[PDB]
């Protein structure tokens, strides 16, 4: 039942300090080494360190000098502080639980958060422009009607998309983003539906771009 | 200090047994741990302390230890087992190390033809003095496609942005291609085409202003 949720700035400038938080829910704060692990795009996992509820820490020797991990037991939150970041620090940062108790799995990470993406760049944050992609049968080769939302020119990653506040999931496909030559990202989310079902349903794409503190709920009309 | 060495790639046919090795001098007196990671997903613990399975992990996944080498064995391999597999260890001092990861590829998977969806620029985008054609490609295998844009039968090379294909959650691939135009360029042509070529065959969609 233990669940972990990471929160971060999305973007940090080179030489600055990266600050992250992990919130623990659905389980005790005791009997665990609360762990940070990271993964650069297309690369492998790298250990960062842990904090125990008493405040005791353990760090990857290669990163110890730049890294500080702290815990707030009352809030069931732990924090990461990584000083003097470079492009080598651009990665998805995971919070994970190492269970530490009689009957545990040893030095293993049995539950992980979904991770938070961190880009180390001089570029500024940019919220997306969201455009509706009006319903059309002639749009697709798939024998259905297709509608969607174009999410354009945002930075950094990621944007998440849901439809009708999560009430519409079948036929939803949110595509991986493209890195445009401008240095900005774009993606599309498409809903494929029977053409006869058009007009019986309201379609709104819920766009979330946490790095820019922007949300957009875009109505897609015929 | 120590490094965990695992091969970057292992290929097997359906129904066969995949074997992934991880080796270090450190492993003689240290436990190993195995993780499976699917694209766009957090890792899943599959083996702990060399040989033990967590409750959700079936017997077809087995870990073994022999001196300075540990082995993850996956029997009855199917397409759903395609993922990155990581070995991991820790020493007494608290130096936790991951291997470089092993990509498992399942050979002999059947071809899947692409679905192509093309949207014209929205009226809202045109009012913002911009124009983007959106070509979305999904459910294809293997993961190699070519995208060609045309305006009234003439190729368009400038203003094209196209993704590398990536794995969907059904082991098929998805890709996207975007054509940027001025609203003036958009209205000046009778029709635009997104032509998607996959395994020698082409699926084309057209749009007209």
């Amino acid at each position: 039942e233990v669940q972990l949720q990471e929160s971060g700035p999305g973007l940090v400038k080179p030489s600055e300090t990266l600050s992250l938080t992990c919130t623990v829910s659905g389980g005790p704060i005791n009997n665990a080494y609360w762990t940070w692990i990271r993964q650069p795009p297309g690369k492998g996992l790298e250990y960062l360190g842990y904090v125990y509820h008493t405040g005791v820490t353990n760090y990857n020797p290669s990163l110890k000098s730049r890294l500080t991990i702290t815990i707030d037991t009352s809030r069931k939150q732990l924090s990461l502080s990584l000083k003097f970041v470079t492009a080598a620090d651009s990665a998805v940062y995971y919070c994970a639980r190492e269970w530490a108790e009689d009957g545990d799995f040893g030095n293993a990470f049995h539950v992980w958060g979904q991770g938070t993406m961190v880009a180390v760049s001089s570029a500024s944050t940019k919220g997306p422009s969201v455009f509706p992609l009006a319903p059309s049968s002639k749009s697709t080769s798939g024998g259905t009607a297709a509608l969607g939302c174009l999410v354009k020119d945002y930075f950094p990653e990621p944007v998440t998309v849901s439809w009708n506040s999560g009430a519409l999931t079948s036929g939803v496909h949110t595509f991986p983003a493209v890195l445009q030559s401008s240095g900005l990202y774009s993606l599309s989310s498409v809903v494929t539906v029977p053409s006869s079902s058009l007009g019986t349903q309201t379609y709104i794409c819920n766009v979330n771009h946490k790095p820019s503190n922007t949300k957009v709920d875009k109505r897609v009309e015929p | 200090s120590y490094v965990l060495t695992q091969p970057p790639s292992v290929s097997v046919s359906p129904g066969q047994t995949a074997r992934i090795t991880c080796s270090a001098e450190a492993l003689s007196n240290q436990y190993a741990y195995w993780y499976r990671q699917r694209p766009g997903q957090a890792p899943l613990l599959i083996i702990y302390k060399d040989t033990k399975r967590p409750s959700g992990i079936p017997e077809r996944f087995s870990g073994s230890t022999s001196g300075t080498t540990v082995t993850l064995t996956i029997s009855g391999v199917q397409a759903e087992d395609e993922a990155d597999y990581y070995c991991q260890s820790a020493d007494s001092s608290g130096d936790y190390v991951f291997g470089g990861g092993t990509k498992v590829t399942v050979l002999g998977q059947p071809k899947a033809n692409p679905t192509v969806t093309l949207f014209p620029p929205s009226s809202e985008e045109l009012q913002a003095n911009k124009a983007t054609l959106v070509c979305l490609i999904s459910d294809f295998y293997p993961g190699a496609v070519t995208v060609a844009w045309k305006a009234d039968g003439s190729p368009v090379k400038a203003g094209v942005e196209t993704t590398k294909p990536s794995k969907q959650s059904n082991n098929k691939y998805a890709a996207s291609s975007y054509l940027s135009l001025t609203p003036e360029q958009w209205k000046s042509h009778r029709s635009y085409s997104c032509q998607v070529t996959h395994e020698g065959s082409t699926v084309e969609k057209t749009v007209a202003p």
Binding site: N30, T54, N58, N107 | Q30, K49, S92, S93
Partner: peptide
Amino acid sequence: RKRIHIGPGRAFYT
């Protein structure tokens, strides 16, 4: 049979 990183939260020594 093998040694783990114990850390502050384990009664690994019975």
